[PDB]
Design a protein around this ligand. Sequence first.
Ligand SMILES: Nc1ncnc2c1ncn2[C@H]1C[C@H](O)[C@@H](COP(=O)(O)OP(=O)(O)OP(=O)(O)O)O1
Ligand SMILES: Nc1ncnc2c1ncn2[C@H]1C[C@H](O)[C@@H](COP(=O)(O)OP(=O)(O)OP(=O)(O)O)O1
Ligand SMILES: [Mg+2]
Ligand SMILES: [Mg+2]
Lengths: 545, 542
Amino acid sequence: DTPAGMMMKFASETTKPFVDDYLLSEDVRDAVMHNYIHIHDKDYYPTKSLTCVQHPLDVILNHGFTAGHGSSRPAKRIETAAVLACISLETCQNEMHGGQAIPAFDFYLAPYVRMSYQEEVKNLEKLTGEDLSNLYDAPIDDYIEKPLDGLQGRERLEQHAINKTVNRVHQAMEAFIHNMNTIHSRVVFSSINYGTDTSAEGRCIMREILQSTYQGVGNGETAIFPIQIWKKKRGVNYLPEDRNYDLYKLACKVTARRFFPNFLNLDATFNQNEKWRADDPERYKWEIATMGCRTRVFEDRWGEKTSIARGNLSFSTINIVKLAIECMGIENEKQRIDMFFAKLDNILDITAKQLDERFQFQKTAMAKQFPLLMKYLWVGAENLKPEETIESVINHGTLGIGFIGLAECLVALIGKHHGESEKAQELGLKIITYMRDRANEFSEQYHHNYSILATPAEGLSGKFTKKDRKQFGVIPGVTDRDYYTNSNHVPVYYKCTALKKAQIEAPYHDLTRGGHIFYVEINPSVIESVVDMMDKYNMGYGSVN
Amino acid sequence: DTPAGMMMKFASETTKPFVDDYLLSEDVRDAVMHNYIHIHDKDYYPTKSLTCVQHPLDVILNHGFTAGHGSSRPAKRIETAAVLACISLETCQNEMHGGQAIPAFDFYLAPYVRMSYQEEVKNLEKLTGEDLSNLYDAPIDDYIEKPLDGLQGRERLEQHAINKTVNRVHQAMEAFIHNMNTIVFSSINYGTDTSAEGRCIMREILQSTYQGVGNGETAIFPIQIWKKKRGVNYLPEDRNYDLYKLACKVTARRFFPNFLNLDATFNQNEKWRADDPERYKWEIATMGCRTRVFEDRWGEKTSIARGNLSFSTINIVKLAIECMGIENEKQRIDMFFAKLDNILDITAKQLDERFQFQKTAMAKQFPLLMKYLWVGAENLKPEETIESVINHGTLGIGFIGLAECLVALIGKHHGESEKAQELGLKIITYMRDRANEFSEQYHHNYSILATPAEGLSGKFTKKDRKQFGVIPGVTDRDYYTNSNHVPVYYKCTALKKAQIEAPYHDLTRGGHIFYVEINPSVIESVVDMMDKYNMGYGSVNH
Ligand SMILES: Nc1ncnc2c1ncn2[C@H]1C[C@H](O)[C@@H](COP(=O)(O)OP(=O)(O)OP(=O)(O)O)O1
Ligand SMILES: Nc1ncnc2c1ncn2[C@H]1C[C@H](O)[C@@H](COP(=O)(O)OP(=O)(O)OP(=O)(O)O)O1
Ligand SMILES: [Mg+2]
Ligand SMILES: [Mg+2]
């Protein structure tokens, strides 16, 4: 009952009705309280804050950041760069409502491990002066630790300069884990992605944080934050011959007891670009990155295909279960199936209209309303004055239309869900491709970017399930198992193996360009099998615990 | 503009009317909107949160903290200890509505300066394997720095390690400054720790607040206070005289740090010494909000694990103006003291009635506060109505606007009159007497306070000008003067200003300050004038 929590609760309670009655449209707000649609993070509407953004740390580290009197200076070393990343994630969280994301953590923090290594290199000569000025440009395969027992030369001290460097970076990453875990406010949902940087700095960063989320906080308590995602790329870390196969095995072993990190698939046929090369200094631009809230921002109709500096403005969830339940009553299956798609066409248009309306509201903004947000992070910054109505900056944005509850939808007209019938598994794929088609059509119409999303249901776990009992109730197999199932998942109350669930739920990921997950409830052998199933049936994102 | 600012503004706007019409009693809610009193931090009433506390870092450093899921192990080095102090300040800021202060800031990090020095004391024998099992207990005078040009023998490992810790204990204070300067009302006081491990925390913080933040820009936070004592740092022969001169020189261009005086009649104890490891408990410490917590009618005289629960300000100007009209001076002077007793009783009743709601609390409503940082902790279950702990708090009755009250019946403020100074040193001693009487009656601790006017500067002056009319020298010269200061619109020297504003400090046991507006010669002279009489707290800035 922390007082800061009460202040946040009061703010939310005094803001949400004002948002509903003063900042929305009648048509959309009619469905926002009719269990058809659910606007996410509604309490932050009057503030022109955006949901999530992938922070480009290059500008905030080469240059500084200014917010009020907070005049900072460019970073110098690892113990300042990691803390600056924490400060940026915290400060931006005060100017945004969703979760903060660091795409290619290794790519961002690679140079400030090399700089710290140089700083240490120019310190070991103070004991015994020597002209070692060639360690600024000495290639190193990786930064490893070992006992300093047995050596009779500068090798005893050349490796020691990394021995303290790896410990310094390890303590920095442990502080990063704790600092993102010491939730004392009325809570920051930071997510980091890594796995595709083939350098000594990147691999040291990726190895000294996976071994720190396995030790645990406190006396051995499993940490809750940050959410960690591993990027799997063919030719990089998947095959045994690949470069980062060992880190993939380490991630599997850590997930075997702490249920982290999650896994992301860059070999998906919808996560590819035409400018990715193994030698590109900035290849991380053309690579999809996600967060713990299952958010994807990759393509751009009016911009270069990238994820950096972009993000999501807002999104909302659609309760297809209500439509499916309302579709009952009629006898023939063809008529009910046809009527289900009619109820899905208008709601997609309503959601796209809501997203465009929030786009209208969020424009005519100020660069000084959210410091450090529309000044160094978003794509359009550095070109418009602190008050000159930033409008050439918000075009490169994305919008989401979410859905939840496929199992109870697949039991409303045929009687069996997609775990006991093959007819059901064919109807399930139809009600997602149509959503994708209508999303593309609405993006052509309203002149923006739209996508289809499988919401995590972390704040929608039971609201729709409980409130559906208004015009009906006690329906066997649907309104008898407490929470609604996940977006497109096989019900937990149905006994199933791993292979069958993987085959059933896989095809729904290419259609969902906003986000998705494959969830399995229980040695890294099991995690390896789950990742193999995820890769084989072209899935993408997957979690096991 | 900022979403975080807008959420806090909405929370304040939705919480203040609820406090006004539901929680507070009608007797003292009548005076809060009548421009007679102002309850500070009215917004954080419904949450059981005390105003300010001095942080006993020893318990949250020797043992960790388990606020929420954040299970933390004990600290090990200066970086970890300083970041943990910052985290503790930030966490308690989410559970208290006032300002966080570190009592004897140099006292609470010296052991982890020593331990950090021990970090490299074995990281330097790694290259040169040697049995150095004595530098853990090697006495040192100060942690000095100098160019490393010329040295041989067993000193490039046993003395450079002592010398390399300068840049480790340093930039830790800089991260502390910037972290407190980046969007927290943090206060640090130091000056009376004679060890090298304590003086290293004092030199590196004055130097870091002189360089400033950014590209040579003056910093705003944290507020820094220097504790001056006879036998420690005042006389030229004293131990920390050089650091006092350095603080004056830094204040000569950055207007920081402030100055606190332990050489006062009201800032003494009977168990203090020069060798007690815990002697800092008997040393008074303050914040930037002028808060004093030293006296305890049912407890030991201490300041460490205590703080203020609530306080409110009075408007003596309204009483003085309502006392006008009559001709004779004696009758109006008597009526002014008549109108001051009832409001003192009302304020004491308010400070007890707010104590009533802060009573019957639960230790789980604010972790790390009523489980680690307070007097009486470690004896109470997470929900079993902690009540044998909140009896060690303090309650404050504040006042401001002495110049306007010194021109309502006499006509000339204490700067331009000698009959006004005599009347000036009568309306505060009465408040002190009545505060002691109400502390005897209501069975709590009460004190008299001089507010910093950081949230009350014009809130009284505007309505005072709009209520009756335009009155020369009273409600026609923009902002009011400070608590008991010489008016700004008057050409006065420093000696006369000190002679006028000196006697009041012994009367106000809650807070007070001496303000001067512009080489460290001027600051040194201001501190000399502070020591010449009984001042306690003072600062000179332009
Ligand atoms: N804990 C912190 N919170 C917020 N900002 C911080 C923190 N620590 C450091 N900073 C920022 C703000 C300062 O303006 C900036 C100083 O730059 P920094 O990365 O420390 O190296 P530098 O270039 O100043 O090197 P040096 O001080 O060694 O010359 O760092
Ligand atoms: N940046 C931070 N923010 C919040 N808490 C932190 C931060 N850094 C460290 N902590 C806290 C939480 C950790 O459990 C605790 C451990 O601190 P520290 O003394 O460095 O570790 P330790 O006692 O485990 O020793 P070591 O890791 O060197 O073996 O400090
Ligand atoms: Mg550790
Ligand atoms: Mg610096």
